[PDB]
Scaffold this active site. Structure first.
Site, short mmCIF file in Angstrom:
data_model
loop_
_atom_site.label_atom_id
_atom_site.label_comp_id
_atom_site.label_asym_id
_atom_site.label_seq_id
_atom_site.Cartn_x
_atom_site.Cartn_y
_atom_site.Cartn_z
N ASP A 230 0.82 -1.20 0.00
CA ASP A 230 0.00 0.00 0.00
C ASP A 230 0.87 1.26 0.00
C1 LIG Z 1 0.19 11.64 17.88
C2 LIG Z 1 -0.49 12.28 16.67
C3 LIG Z 1 -1.96 11.90 16.56
C4 LIG Z 1 -2.61 12.43 15.28
C5 LIG Z 1 -3.97 11.79 15.04
C6 LIG Z 1 -4.67 12.13 13.73
C7 LIG Z 1 -5.95 11.30 13.60
C8 LIG Z 1 -5.71 9.97 12.90
C9 LIG Z 1 -6.99 9.33 12.38
C10 LIG Z 1 -7.11 9.44 10.86
C11 LIG Z 1 -8.46 8.97 10.35
C12 LIG Z 1 -8.44 8.72 8.84
O1 LIG Z 1 -8.04 7.69 8.41
S1 LIG Z 1 -9.05 10.00 7.70
C13 LIG Z 1 -9.67 9.17 6.21
C14 LIG Z 1 -9.62 10.12 5.01
N1 LIG Z 1 -10.36 9.56 3.89
C15 LIG Z 1 -9.82 8.43 3.15
O2 LIG Z 1 -8.78 7.97 3.46
C16 LIG Z 1 -10.58 7.84 1.97
C17 LIG Z 1 -9.75 7.09 0.95
N2 LIG Z 1 -8.41 6.91 1.48
C18 LIG Z 1 -7.25 7.09 0.62
O3 LIG Z 1 -7.41 7.39 -0.52
C19 LIG Z 1 -5.84 6.91 1.18
O4 LIG Z 1 -4.92 7.41 0.25
C20 LIG Z 1 -5.53 5.44 1.47
C21 LIG Z 1 -6.40 4.52 0.63
C22 LIG Z 1 -5.77 5.16 2.95
C23 LIG Z 1 -4.06 5.18 1.14
O5 LIG Z 1 -3.89 5.43 -0.23
P1 LIG Z 1 -2.66 4.68 -1.03
O6 LIG Z 1 -3.15 3.36 -1.56
O7 LIG Z 1 -2.21 5.55 -2.18
O8 LIG Z 1 -1.51 4.45 -0.08
#
Ligand SMILES: CCCCCCCCCCCC(=O)SCCNC(=O)CCNC(=O)[C@H](O)C(C)(C)COP(=O)(O)O
Ligand SMILES: CCCCCCCCCCCCCCCCCC(=O)OC[C@H](COP(=O)([O-])OCC(O)COP(=O)([O-])OC[C@@H](COC(=O)CCCCCCCCCCCCCCCCC)OC(=O)CCCCCCCCCCCCCCCCC)OC(=O)CCCCCCCCCCCCCCCCC
Ligand SMILES: CCCCCCCCCCCCCCCCC[C@@H](O)O[C@H](CO[C@H](O)CCCCCCCCCCCCCCC)COP(=O)(O)OCC[N+](C)(C)C
Ligand SMILES: CCCCCCCCCCCCCCCCC[C@@H](O)O[C@H](CO[C@H](O)CCCCCCCCCCCCCCC)COP(=O)(O)OCC[N+](C)(C)C
Ligand SMILES: CCCCCCCC/C=C\CCCCCCCC(=O)OC[C@H](COP(=O)(O)OCCN)OC(=O)CCCCCCC/C=C\CCCCCCCC
Ligand SMILES: CCCCCCCC/C=C\CCCCCCCC(=O)OC[C@H](COP(=O)(O)OCCN)OC(=O)CCCCCCC/C=C\CCCCCCCC
Ligand SMILES: CCCCCCCC/C=C\CCCCCCCC(=O)O[C@H](COC(=O)CCCCCCC/C=C/CCCCCCCC)COP(=O)(O)OCCN
Lengths: 52, 88, 178, 459, 128, 603, 103
Positions: free
Chosen positions: B43
Site C-alpha cells: 500500500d
Molecule cells: C500523535 C499524533 C496523533 C494524530 C492523530 C490524527 C488522527 C488519525 C486518524 C485518521 C483517520 C483517517 O483515516 S481519515 C480518512 C480520510 N479519507 C480516506 O482515506 C478515503 C480514501 N483513502 C485514501 O485514498 C488513502 O490514500 C488510502 C487509501 C488510505 C491510502 O492510499 P494509497 O493506496 O495511495 O496508499
C-alpha cells in the site's frame, strides 16, 4: 538596464492601472492589493502576507 | 567523526537488509529492481513506513515531496547516494 | 528538495503527509520502541478504517478533524534529526561550502600545486561551454509557447547532448567539504 | 605654523607638474611626510596655548584634529586610487587638487586665532567638498545632495556672521585670547537670546543636530569614497570645534538655552540608533550611526563640564577614525558588487577572511569596546551626564545596547551565513585595501595607550 | 472535540488548519496553476541568466530594486497631509521631547533647591 | 623579594605568549593546540605557588604597576588585586581550562580551523583572568566586555548557521542589558566617591545607598542569567561543546556573581538590595530547575542546571555569605565542567546526536563516561564527603538558619528537589533503558586525551572540596547547633526528588498514552518566556524603527518643515514676481501708485 | 505516482555526471607539489623560554621600577597573634587571660 516605468508609482485608482501595477510587480490582478491610500508613502506596492 | 566512507554496496546491502526484515515482504521474492505498488502489492502507507524505516536506518529524513515518489529500492539507493555524495 | 512541487496537493498526498507527521510525533511521544510499535500499529488500524470511503465531502470532512486533533496533540518538543531544518546541525557546514569559480582566482604559484586537477577542470569548462550553447537552443525549441507551465526540466534527447542547466547541480561543493 | 601650511600648498605644484603616471605615488609619499611634520604639534603645555603668531595658534583641542586631518589625506588618495582608473590625467589632477585644497582649508580653519577668519575658512571648506560630491558622484541625486549640503549650512551660517560682526562692534575684538580673558556675563534678554541662537545654530546644523540631520545620509550615499571619508572623519568635527570655541561668551545663558538641544540630542541618539536596525543600505546605516555619535558629542558640549569636554574630544577623534574605516569597507564591497545594498552580497567571510577580520575589528571599535578610546569618550560623557542629571543613564544605556545591536547586525548580514550564489565576480582583496584598513585601525589601538594626547585642554 | 487554536499577529494560523484550502473549486485550481506558471517563468529566467558561462557579474534583480526604491525614495512624493499622519507625526516627534524636558527640568529644579537649602551632602564630589 | 607578586604576574604574563606567537609559523602547523595546552598547564602549576603562600600566611597584596592617564584628582593605573578570591579562583580556572583544551584536542579533530579555536579559548581565558584580578572598576569593565565578546565569537562558531548567529546576538543583547547597570554603578561611584579604585570605594562608603548597589545587581543579573535575563544561557548551547563546557557552564557565567562577591562590604550595609538579590536568586533557581525537568536535549538540561546553581549562588549572596558563594563557585566549576565533558563524549559517540530519546543503554556500551557522569551527578546533587557537599550542605544550612524570606526558602527547597529530579531524569533516559540510536554502531572511547581529561576533573570532583574546605582559614560563623530534622532537610529532599522522579519515569514503560496537561506544556516551553519576549518586544521595536522613526519624521515631516516649505514658498513667489506680460501700461500704473505711496508715506 | 519516464532520464544523466565530477575531485599521489626553499628536551627548552625569561623580566621590573615609586605594592600587614615574636624588634606579644579549659 532598468526603465522609468518599472519603479513604484502612485496609488492605483482605476482597474486598468491597478492591473498594470500588478503586471509590474509580477503577480495576479486578483492576488495584487495595495496598502490603504493614506498619507504614508506606500504608494503602489504589494501588501504581501505578513507571515514571517 | 571517525565515520567509515560508506559506499554504494553498503547502502544497497543495508536497504535490502531492512527490506528483508519486514515481514510483509517474502525475502526470496524481493529484488533490487522490485517495485513496491505492483511487483509486491504494498500500500501507499506501506511505502511511507518503508520511508520511515529508511529514515531511522540512515540517520536522516527524506523530504516528503521526494519520499512519496520513490517506488523502487534501486532508485531509493540512488537518491540516498546522491544525497550523501557517494563515490562508488 | 530535488523534485519540483506541483500546483497543489491532492487528498491522498495530504492524508499521507498527516500520517507521516502523526507517526513521527507519536514516536517522539513514546520514547521506548515497544510502546511506539504498539501505538503506531493502533494508529495505523485507526487510519485504515476509512480507506474505502468514496464520498468527496466525507473525505474532506475527514483528515481535517484529524489535522485539528493532531495540532492539539503534537508533542510541543518533537524529535528532529540533526541535519533536518529543525536539527542541531542543520546548517553547521554551510560555512565550509565555497563555490567553484573561486579556483579561477587562485595565484599561479598556488595553481602550480595540483596541476592534474586544474587540467581536468579545464576539460570540464570546455564541456560546459559547448553543452550550454547546445542547451540554449534545445530549451528554446522544447519550451511551450507563452512560457513554461511547470518548473521541471526536460532531459537530453540526442547523443552528444547533456541535461539542460546541469553545471550548478552537478558541481555542488559537497555535503561535508571539510 | 607655516611649516605645515607651506608644504601643503606646495603639494599643488608637485601634483600638477608630476608625470602622468606618478601622481598617486608622489601625493601619497608627500602627504605622509606632511603628517609626520604635523605630529610635532602634539607637544602641548598645561599653560595657555602654542601661540605661533598673531594669525595662527595651536591648542590641545586643535592639535589632535590637525593631526587627524593631515593623516586622512593619504588614506583618501589610496582609497580613491581605484575607481579613478579610467579618467584623464587632467581630471585626476583636478581631483587631487580638490583634496589638497580641502586639507589646506581645514588646516587653516583649526588654528584661526580670529573668529572671522575662522568663519571664512570654515565656509571655504564647503566649496571643494561640494565640487567633489557633485562632479565625481555616481547617481543623479548628487546635485540635489549638494544643494542640501550647501543651503542648510548657509542658512545656519549667515546669522553667525551677523552675530560675529555685531560682537566686534560691542566687544572690540574677535581674537580668541582677548575674548576669553575679557569675557563678561550675558544678561538674560531677548537680544542676548537671539545672539546665542545665531552663534550656536551654525555649528549645530553641521554636527548634525537630530532635527537637522536630513542632509547627512544623502550626502554620504551620493559622495565618492573620498568624500565620505572626509565628511565622516573631519567635516563633522568642525561643529564641535566651533561650539567648544564659542561657548565661552555664551555663559551664563547656556544653562537656560541648552534644554531644547539637549532633549533633541538625547532622544535623537536613540531614534537614529533604532533607525540603523532597519536599513537596506550600508552608507545610510553608517551615516545614521555617525548621527548618533555626534548627538552624544553635542550633549557633551552642551553640558559644559571638564569631563564633558574631554570625552567629547576623545569621541570625536575615535568616531572619525572608525567611521572612515567602516566607509572604506563598504566602498570595498560596492566596487566589487556595484549594488550598495546589504542583503545582496552576503557570507563574504568564507570568501574574504582577512577582510572579515577587518570588518570585525571595525564593528568592535564602533561598538565602543574597552579600552578603546571610543569607550573612553563614551564613558566620560556618560559620567558627566550622570552628574548633570541621574535620569540620563537610562537613555545612555539604551543607546549603548542599540549601538551594539546594530553594529553586530551590520557585521552579521554581510559577513556570516551563506554566500549569494549568482555572484561570482568577487576577486581576492588587494594589498591596497588591506593596507588601507590596517592604516585605519592601528592608530586607534596605538592612541588607546596614550589617551591624554586626545583629551583636550581640560585634561 | 478539542480546544480551538486562536491565531494572532505573532502566532499565525497553521497551514493545515485553514478553512480556505478545503473549499476547492476549478477557479481556485486555475489560480494555483497560473501562480505556479508565474513562479516557473521566473525560475526559468533566473536559471537561464544563471547557468550562462559568459556571464561574470551580478544578476540584477528587478524585485530588489523595486523594494529598495519603494523603501527609500518613493515616500515623500506619495505623501499626503492627513489627520492620521499629522497627528501621528506630531505625537511621535514632539511628545517625547517635552516629556523628557519635563522630567529633567523637574529633577534639576529639585536638585538646585536641595543645593540652596544646603542638605544634599556633596562631600567627596570633586569631579563633575 | 616576596615572590608573590612576581609569580602572580608571571602566570598571567605567560598566559599570553601563544597569542604573541599566533603570527609565527607554529600557528600554521598541527602542533599549535598542544602548544597552548602545555602553556596553560604550566601556568596552572606556576599559579599553584601563590595559593600555597596564601594558605600558609594569608598574604594579600595590591600591585599598581603601570600608571595610566590621570584626570585631575582622579588617578587611573594598571592595578591588580591578589586577595584570597583571586589567588583561589586562578588555579581552578586554569585547571578547568587545561581539561577543556585536552578534551578539545579530540573533540575538534575534524575542524579545519582548530588553531583559531584554541586561540579563541586562550583569549577568553586571558580576558577572564583580567576580570578576576582587577582592582579598579575600569579594568573590571575591560574583562567584563572581553569575555562577552569572546563568548559571541565562540557561540557563532559555525557562521553558516542562522540559529548560532541568533544565539550569539541574544547573548550580546542580554549582556548589554546588564551593562546598563554596570555603567550606572561606575558613574555613581566616580561621581560620589571620586574614585574607581576598590580601596577608596570601600573607604568612603560606610552606608552604601540604593543606586550603585542596584546597578551592580543589574549587571550581575545580566551576566549570570537570572530570571529576568535567563534565556541567553540556554540558547548559548548552539556553539561547540567545549565552549559550553568552559565558558557557559563554569568560568564566565559566575563572573556576575563574582562581581557581587567583590563588593560584599557594601552589600552587607544595605538591606533592601540584599532582599532583592535573595528573591531574584530564588526565583531564578526555581524557574530554571522547573524548565530543566522536562527537557530532552542533554546540553539544554545541563545548562538549565547551571542556571539554577547560579541562582543558588545569588541566594547565598543575598543571605550575606559571600565566602560560601565563592566556595560554591569553586566546586561548581569542577563538577559542571566534568558533566558537560561527559555529555560531549556522549554526543560525539552518537554521530552528533543530542536528543535523549535516541539514546538508550550506555552503562555497559561505554563504562568510563558512565561512571564519570554518575559521580558528577551525585556530586552536583550534593552528598556527604563529596565536593558538592561542602557548598551544598552549608548553603542550605545557612539559608535555613537566617532571617530570610519564607517564600525564598520554599523555592530553594523545591529547586533542590527538582535538581535531584532532573539528574535522575538524565541518567535514567541516557544510561538505563534499551539502546535507541541508529543501528550502525560507531561507539568508541579508547582515546587517551578524553580519558585523561575526564579523570583529572574526576579526581578534582572527588577530593578538591575536602582539601580546599579543610585548607582555607575560617571566614564566617558556622551553624554548629541545629534540630536534627532541620539538619537533614537537604538529604531528605534530594532523596524524595530522586524517588518521586524515578517512579514517574518508570511509568513510561506502561502501554498507555494520554495527552499532557497545561503544566507540562508550560514547563517544556520555558514558561513561554522565550516565545512572547522574543516576538512581542522585538516586533514592536522594529516596526516603530521603520514607521515612526524612518519614514514619518525623518523622511516626511522633517523634510516638510524646513526644506520643502522653503522650496514651495520660493517657487510660488518666484512665479508671482516673474509673471509679467511686458506691458509698460501695467508697469507705469504700478510706478504711479508707488510714487503716490512714497509721497504720502515717507513725509 | 512516482517519477515520469522523462524524469528518470534526467536524473540518470545528471547523476552519472555528478559521479564523474565527484571522482574528478580526487587527488593524485604527486598533486601537492610543494616547492622547498630555506635560508624532556622539548620541555627543557620550553621551561626556560616560556617560564624563566618571563619571571626574570617581571621580577626585575617589579623590584626595580614598580617598587621604586611609593604605594605601588601594598601588603596585608600579616596577622599578629599572641605569643609570637617579631624579627625586626624582637619583643614577644604577651599571652592571653588563661580562660578555663574544659571540653
Ligand atoms: C500523535 C499524533 C496523533 C494524530 C492523530 C490524527 C488522527 C488519525 C486518524 C485518521 C483517520 C483517517 O483515516 S481519515 C480518512 C480520510 N479519507 C480516506 O482515506 C478515503 C480514501 N483513502 C485514501 O485514498 C488513502 O490514500 C488510502 C487509501 C488510505 C491510502 O492510499 P494509497 O493506496 O495511495 O496508499
Ligand atoms: C590580550 C593578550 C594579547 C597580547 C599580545 C599582543 C598582540 C598585539 C596585537 C594588537 C591588535 C592586532 C592588530 C589588529 C588587526 C589584526 C591584524 C590581523 O590581520 O591579524 C592577522 C593574524 C593572523 O590572521 P590570519 O591567520 O592570516 O587570518 C585568519 C582570519 O583573519 C580570521 O581572523 P581571526 O578570527 O583569527 O581574528 C584574529 C583575532 C585578532 O584580531 C583582532 O580582532 C584584533 C583586535 C582586538 C581588539 C579589538 C579592539 C577592541 C578595543 C581594545 C583595544 C586595546 C588596545 C591596547 C593596545 C594595542 C597595541 C597595538 O580576533 C580575535 O581573536 C578576537 C579578539 C577580541 C578580544 C576582545 C578583548 C580585547 C580587550 C582585552 C584587554 C586588552 C588590554 C588588556 C589590559 C589589561 C591587561 C594587561 O591574526 C593575529 O595575529 C591574531 C592577533 C592576536 C589576538 C589579539 C586580541 C587581543 C589584542 C587586543 C589589543 C592588544 C592588547 C595590548 C596588551 C594586552 C595585554
Ligand atoms: C601580530 C601578533 C602579535 C605580535 C607582536 C607582539 C608584541 C605586542 C606588544 C605591542 C602592544 C602590547 C602592550 C605593551 C605596551 C608597551 C609600550 C607602552 O608601554 O608604551 C606606550 C608608548 O606609546 C605611545 O605613548 C602611544 C603611541 C601614540 C600613537 C600616535 C599615532 C601615530 C601617528 C599616526 C597618525 C595619527 C592619526 C591619529 C591622530 C590622533 C606608553 O608609554 P608610557 O607608559 O606612557 O611612558 C613611556 C616611558 N616614558 C615615561 C619615558 C615616557
Ligand atoms: C526643527 C529641529 C530643531 C530646530 C531648532 C530648535 C531649537 C530652538 C528653539 C528655541 C527655544 C525657545 C526660544 C526662546 C526661549 C526663552 C525662554 C522661554 O521659553 O521661557 C519663557 C518665555 O515666555 C514665553 O515663552 C515667551 C516666548 C513666546 C514666543 C516664542 C514662540 C514659541 C513657539 C515657537 C517655536 C518655533 C521655533 C522655530 C521657528 C522657525 C519664560 O517666560 P519670561 O520670564 O517672560 O521670559 C524670559 C526671557 N526674558 C528674560 C528675556 C524676558
Ligand atoms: C619587552 C622587551 C624588553 C624586555 C626588557 C625590559 C624589562 C623591563 C625594563 C623596562 C623598564 C620599565 C619601563 O618601561 O618604565 C615604566 C613604564 C611606564 O613608565 P611610568 O613612568 O611608570 O608611567 C608612564 C607615565 N609617565 O612601564 C611600561 O610601560 C611597561 C609596563 C607597562 C604595563 C604593560 C602594558 C600592558 C597593557 C597595555 C595597555 C592596556 C590599555 C590600558 C589599561 C587600562 C588600565 C586601567
Ligand atoms: C527672505 C527669503 C528667504 C529665502 C531663503 C532661501 C532658502 C534657500 C533655498 C532656496 C530654494 C529656491 C528654489 C526652489 O524653491 O525651487 C524648487 C526646486 C525645484 O527644482 P528645480 O531645479 O528648480 O527644477 C526641477 C524640475 N526641472 O526644488 C529643489 O530642487 C530644491 C532642492 C534643494 C533644497 C535645499 C534645502 C534648502 C533649505 C535648507 C535651509 C534653507 C532655509 C533658509 C532660511 C530659513 C529661515 C531661517
Ligand atoms: C539651520 C538654519 C537656522 C538659522 C539660524 C536661525 C536662528 C538665528 C536667529 C535669527 C537671526 C538673528 C541674527 C541676529 C544676529 C546677532 C545680533 C544681536 O544679537 O544683537 C541684537 C539684535 O537682535 C535682533 O535684532 C534679533 C532680531 C531677529 C530678526 C530676524 C529673526 C529671524 C526669524 C526669527 C525666528 C526664529 C528664531 C529661532 C529659530 C531657531 C532656528 C530655526 C541686539 O540688537 P541691538 O538693537 O543692537 O541692541 C541694542 C538694544 N539692547
Amino acid at each position: 538596464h532598468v526603465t522609468k516605468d518599472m519603479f513604484p508609482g502612485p496609488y492605483p485608482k482605476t482597474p486598468e492601472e491597478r492591473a498594470a501595477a500588478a503586471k509590474k510587480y509580477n503577480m495576479r490582478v486578483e492576488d495584487y492589493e495595495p496598502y490603504p491610500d493614506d498619507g504614508m508613502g506606500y504608494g503602489d506596492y504589494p501588501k504581501l502576507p505578513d507571515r514571517s | 567523526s571517525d565515520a567509515p566512507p560508506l559506499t554504494l554496496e553498503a547502502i544497497k546491502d543495508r536497504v535490502l537488509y531492512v527490506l528483508k526484515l519486514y515481514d510483509k515482504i517474502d525475502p526470496e521474492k524481493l529484488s533490487v529492481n522490485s517495485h513496491f505498488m505492483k511487483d509486491l502489492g504494498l500500500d501507499s502507507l506501506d511505502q511511507v513506513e518503508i520511508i520511515m524505516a529508511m529514515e531511522d536506518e540512515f540517520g536522516f529524513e527524506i523530504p516528503d515531496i521526494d519520499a512519496e515518489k520513490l517506488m523502487c529500492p534501486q532508485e531509493i539507493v540512488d537518491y540516498i547516494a546522491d544525497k550523501k555524495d557517494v563515490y562508488e | 528538495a530535488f523534485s519540483a512541487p506541483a500546483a497543489y496537493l491532492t487528498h491522498q498526498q495530504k492524508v499521507l503527509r498527516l500520517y507521516k507527521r502523526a507517526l513521527r510525533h507519536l514516536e517522539s511521544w513514546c520514547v521506548h520502541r515497544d510502546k511506539y510499535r504498539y501505538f503506531a500499529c493502533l494508529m495505523r488500524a485507526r487510519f485504515d478504517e476509512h480507506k474505502n470511503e468514496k464520498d468527496m465531502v466525507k473525505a474532506t470532512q475527514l483528515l481535517r478533524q484529524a489535522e485539528e486533533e493532531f495540532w492539539y496533540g503534537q508533542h510541543p518538543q518533537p524529535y528532529i534529526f540533526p541535519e533536518s531544518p529543525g536539527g542541531t546541525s542543520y546548517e553547521r557546514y554551510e560555512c565550509y561550502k565555497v563555490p567553484e569559480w573561486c579556483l579561477d582566482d587562485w595565484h599561479p604559484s598556488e595553481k602550480a600545486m595540483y596541476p592534474d586537477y586544474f587540467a581536468k577542470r579545464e576539460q570540464w569548462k570546455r564541456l560546459r561551454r559547448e553543452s550550454w550553447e547546445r542547451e540554449v537552443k534545445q530549451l528554446q525549441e522544447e519550451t511551450p509557447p507563452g512560457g513554461p507551465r511547470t518548473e521541471a526540466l526536460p532531459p537530453a534527447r540526442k547523443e552528444g547532448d547533456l541535461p539542460p542547466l546541469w553545471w550548478h547541480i552537478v558541481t555542488r561543493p559537497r555535503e561535508r567539504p571539510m | 605654523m607655516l611649516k605645515i601650511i607651506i608644504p601643503t600648498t606646495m603639494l599643488l605644484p608637485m601634483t600638477w607638474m608630476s608625470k602622468h603616471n606618478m601622481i598617486w605615488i608622489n601625493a601619497t609619499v608627500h602627504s605622509l611626510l606632511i603628517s609626520l611634520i604635523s605630529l610635532s604639534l602634539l607637544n602641548q603645555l598645561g599653560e595657555n596655548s602654542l601661540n605661533f603668531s598673531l594669525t595662527f595658534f595651536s591648542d590641545s583641542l586643535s592639535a589632535p584634529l590637525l593631526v587627524l586631518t593631515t593623516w586622512l589625506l593619504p588614506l583618501m588618495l589610496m582609497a580613491s586610487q581605484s575607481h579613478l582608473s579610467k579618467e584623464t590625467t587632467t581630471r585626476k589632477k583636478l581631483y587631487i587638487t580638490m583634496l589638497i585644497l580641502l586639507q589646506l582649508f581645514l588646516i587653516m580653519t583649526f588654528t584661526a586665532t580670529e573668529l572671522i577668519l575662522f568663519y571664512i575658512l570654515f565656509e571655504a571648506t564647503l566649496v571643494p567638498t561640494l565640487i567633489i560630491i557633485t562632479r565625481w558622484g555616481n547617481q543623479t541625486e548628487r546635485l540635489n545632495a549638494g544643494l542640501y549640503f550647501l543651503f542648510y549650512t548657509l542658512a545656519g551660517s549667515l546669522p553667525l556672521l551677523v552675530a560675529l560682526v555685531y560682537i566686534q562692534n560691542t566687544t572690540g575684538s574677535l581674537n580668541f585670547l582677548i575674548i576669553h580673558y575679557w569675557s563678561h556675563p550675558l544678561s538674560n534678554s531677548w537680544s542676548n537670546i537671539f545672539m546665542w541662537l545665531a552663534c550656536i545654530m551654525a555649528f549645530m546644523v553641521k554636527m548634525p543636530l537630530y532635527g537637522l540631520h536630513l542632509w547627512l545620509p544623502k550626502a554620504h550615499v551620493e559622495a565618492p569614497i573620498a568624500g565620505s571619508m572626509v565628511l565622516a572623519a573631519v567635516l563633522l568635527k568642525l561643529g564641535g570645534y566651533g561650539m567648544m570655541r564659542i561657548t565661552t561668551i555664551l555663559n551664563p545663558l547656556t544653562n537656560y538655552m541648552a534644554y531644547p538641544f539637549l532633549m533633541l540630542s538625547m532622544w535623537g541618539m536613540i531614534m537614529t540608533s533604532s533607525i540603523c536596525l532597519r536599513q537596506t543600505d550600508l552608507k545610510s546605516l553608517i551615516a545614521y550611526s555617525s548621527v548618533s555619535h555626534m548627538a552624544l558629542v553635542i550633549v557633551a558640549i552642551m553640558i559644559q563640564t571638564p569631563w564633558s569636554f574631554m570625552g567629547a574630544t576623545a569621541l570625536m577623534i575615535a568616531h572619525g577614525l572608525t567611521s572612515s574605516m567602516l566607509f572604506c569597507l563598504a566602498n570595498t564591497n560596492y566596487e566589487r558588487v556595484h549594488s550598495r545594498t546589504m542583503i545582496l552580497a552576503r557570507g563574504l567571510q568564507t570568501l574574504l577572511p582577512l577582510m572579515a577580520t577587518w570588518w570585525l575589528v571595525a564593528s568592535l571599535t564602533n561598538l565602543a569596546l574597552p579600552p578603546s578610546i571610543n569607550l573612553i569618550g563614551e564613558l566620560f560623557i556618560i559620567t558627566a551626564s550622570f552628574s548633570w542629571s541621574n535620569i540620563t543613564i537610562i537613555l545612555m544605556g539604551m543607546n549603548m545596547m542599540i549601538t551594539a545591536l546594530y553594529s553586530l547586525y551590520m557585521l552579521i548580514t554581510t559577513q556570516r551565513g551563506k554566500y549569494t550564489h549568482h555572484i561570482n565576480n568577487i576577486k581576492p582583496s588587494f594589498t591596497r585595501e588591506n593596507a588601507l584598513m590596517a592604516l585605519h585601525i592601528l592608530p586607534l589601538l596605538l592612541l588607546t595607550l596614550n589617551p591624554k594626547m586626545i583629551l583636550g585642554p581640560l585634561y | 472535540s478539542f480546544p480551538k487554536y486562536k491565531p494572532s499577529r505573532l502566532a499565525t494560523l497553521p497551514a493545515t488548519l485553514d478553512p480556505a484550502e478545503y473549499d476547492i473549486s476549478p477557479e481556485t485550481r486555475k489560480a494555483q496553476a497560473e501562480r505556479l506558471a508565474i513562479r516557473s517563468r521566473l525560475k526559468r529566467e533566473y536559471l537561464l541568466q544563471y547557468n550562462d558561462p559568459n556571464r561574470l557579474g551580478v544578476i540584477e534583480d528587478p524585485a530588489l530594486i523595486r523594494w529598495t526604491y519603494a523603501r527609500s525614495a518613493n515616500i515623500y512624493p506619495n505623501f499626503r497631509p492627513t489627520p492620521k499622519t499629522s497627528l501621528l507625526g506630531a505625537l511621535f516627534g514632539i511628545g517625547p521631547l517635552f516629556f523628557w524636558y519635563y522630567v529633567f527640568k523637574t529633577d534639576r529644579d529639585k536638585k538646585e533647591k536641595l543645593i540652596q537649602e544646603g542638605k544634599l551632602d556633596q562631600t567627596f564630589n570633586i569631579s563633575y | 623579594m616576596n615572590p608573590f607578586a612576581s609569580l602572580t604576574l608571571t602566570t598571567l604574563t605567560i598566559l599570553t605568549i601563544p597569542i604573541m606567537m599566533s603570527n609565527s609559523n607554529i600557528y600554521k602547523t598541527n602542533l599549535y593546540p598542544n602548544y597552548v595546552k602545555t602553556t596553560v598547564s604550566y601556568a596552572f602549576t606556576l599559579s599553584l605557588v601563590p595559593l600555597l603562600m596564601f594558605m600558609h600566611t594569608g598574604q594579600e597584596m595590591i600591585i599598581s604597576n603601570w600608571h595610566w592617564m590621570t584626570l585631575q584628582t582622579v588617578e587611573l593605573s594598571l592595578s591588580f588585586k591578589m586577595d584570597y578570591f583571586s589567588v583561589m579562583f586562578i588555579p581552578v580556572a586554569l585547571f578547568v581550562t587545561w581539561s577543556i583544551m585536552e578534551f578539545s584536542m579530540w573533540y575538534m579533530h575534524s575542524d579545519p580551523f582548530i588553531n583559531r579555536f584554541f586561540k579563541y579559548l586562550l583569549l577568553f581565558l586571558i580576558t577572564m583572568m583580567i576580570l578576576v584580578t582587577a582592582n579598579n572598576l575600569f579594568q573590571l569593565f575591560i574583562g567584563w566586555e572581553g569575555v562577552g565578546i569572546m563568548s559571541f565569537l565562540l557561540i557563532g562558531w559555525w557562521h553558516g548557521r542562522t540559529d548560532a548567529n541568533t544565539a550569539a546576538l541574544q547573548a550580546i543583547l542580554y549582556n548589554r542589558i546588564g551593562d546598563i547597570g554596570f555603567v550606572l554603578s561606575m558613574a555613581w561611584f566616580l561621581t560620589h566617591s571620586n574614585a574607581w579604585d576598590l580601596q577608596q570605594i570601600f573607604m568612603l562608603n560606610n552606608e552604601c545607598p540604593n543606586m550603585p548597589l542596584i546597578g551592580l545587581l543589574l549587571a550581575a543579573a545580566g551576566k549570570s542569567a537570572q530570571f529576568g535575563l535567563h534565556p541567553w544561557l540556554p540558547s548559548a548551547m548552539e556553539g561547540p561543546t567545549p565552549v559550553s563546557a568552559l565558558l557557559h557552564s563554569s568560568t564566565m557565567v559566575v563572573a556576575g556573581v563574582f562581581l557581587l562577591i567583590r563588593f560584599y562590604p557594601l552589600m552587607e550595609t544595605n538591606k533592601l538590595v540584599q532582599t532583592m538579590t535573595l528573591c531574584l536568586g530564588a526565583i531564578t533557581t526555581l524557574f530554571t530547575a522547573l524548565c530543566a525537568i522536562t527537557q530532552n536535549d542533554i546540553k539544554k538540561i545541563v545548562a538549565f542546571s547551571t542556571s539554577s546553581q547560579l541562582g543558588l549562588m545569588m541566594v547565598t549572596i543575598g543571605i550575606n555569605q559571600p565566602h560560601l558563594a565563592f566556595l560554591h563557585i569553586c566546586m561548581h566549576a569542577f563538577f559542571k565542567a566534568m558533566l558537560f565533558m561527559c555529555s560531549g563524549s556522549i554526543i560525539h559517540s552518537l554521530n552528533d546526536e543530542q536528543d535523549i530519546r535516541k539514546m538508550g543503554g550506555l552503562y555497559k556500551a561505554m563504562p568510563f563516561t558512565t561512571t564519570a557522569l554518575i559521580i558528577g551527578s551525585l556530586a552536583l546533587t550534593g552528598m556527604p564527603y563529596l565536593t558538592g557537599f561542602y557548598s551544598k550542605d552549608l548553603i542550605i544550612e545557612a539559608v535555613n538558619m537566617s532571617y530570610t524570606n519564607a517564600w525564598a526558602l520554599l523555592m530553594t527547597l523545591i529547586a533542590t528537589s527538582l535538581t535531584a529530579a532532573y539528574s535522575t531524569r538524565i541518567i535514567f533516559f541516557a544510561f538505563l533503558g534499551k539502546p535507541r540510536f541508529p543501528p550502525l554502531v560507531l561507539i568508541n572511547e579508547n582515546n587517551p586525551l578524553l580519558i585523561n581529561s575526564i579523570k583529572r576533573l574526576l579526581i578534582g570532583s572527588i577530593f578538591a572540596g575536602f582539601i580546599i574546605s579543610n585548607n582555607i582559614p575560617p571566614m564566617t560563623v558556622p551553624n554548629t547547633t541545629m534540630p536534627l530534622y532541620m539538619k537533614m532537610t537537604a538529604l531528605i529532599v534530594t532523596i524524595m526528588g530522586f524517588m518521586l522522579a524515578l517512579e514517574l519515569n518508570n511509568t513510561t514503560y506502561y502501554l498507555k498514552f494520554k495527552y499532557p496537561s497545561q503544566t507540562y506544556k508550560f514547563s517544556n516551553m520555558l514558561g513561554y518566556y522565550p516565545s512572547i519576549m522574543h516576538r512581542l518586544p522585538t516586533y514592536h521595536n522594529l516596526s516603530m524603527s521603520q514607521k515612526s522613526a524612518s519614514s514619518l519624521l525623518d523622511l516626511i515631516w522633517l523634510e516638510t518643515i524646513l526644506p520643502k516649505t522653503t522650496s514651495f514658498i520660493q517657487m510660488k513667489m518666484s512665479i508671482m514676481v516673474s509673471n509679467q506680460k511686458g506691458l509698460i501700461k501695467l508697469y507705469f500704473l504700478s510706478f504711479l501708485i508707488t510714487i503716490m505711496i512714497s509721497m504720502t508715506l515717507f513725509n | 505516482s512516482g517519477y515520469t519516464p522523462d524524469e528518470k532520464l534526467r536524473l540518470q544523466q545528471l547523476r552519472e555526471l555528478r559521479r564523474r565530477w565527484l571522482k574528478d575531485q580526487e587527488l593524485s599521489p604527486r598533486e601537492p607539489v610543494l616547492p622547498p626553499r630555506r635560508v624532556t628536551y622539548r620541555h627543557s627548552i620550553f621551561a626556560v623560554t616560556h617560564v624563566l625569561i618571563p619571571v626574570w623580566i617581571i621580577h626585575y621590573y617589579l623590584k626595580y621600577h614598580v617598587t621604586a615609586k611609593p604605594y605601588t605594592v601594598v601588603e596585608r600587614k600579616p596577622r599578629i597573634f599572641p605569643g609570637d615574636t617579631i624579627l625586626e624588634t624582637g619583643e614577644v606579644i604577651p599571652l592571653m587571660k588563661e580562660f578555663p579549659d574544659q571540653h
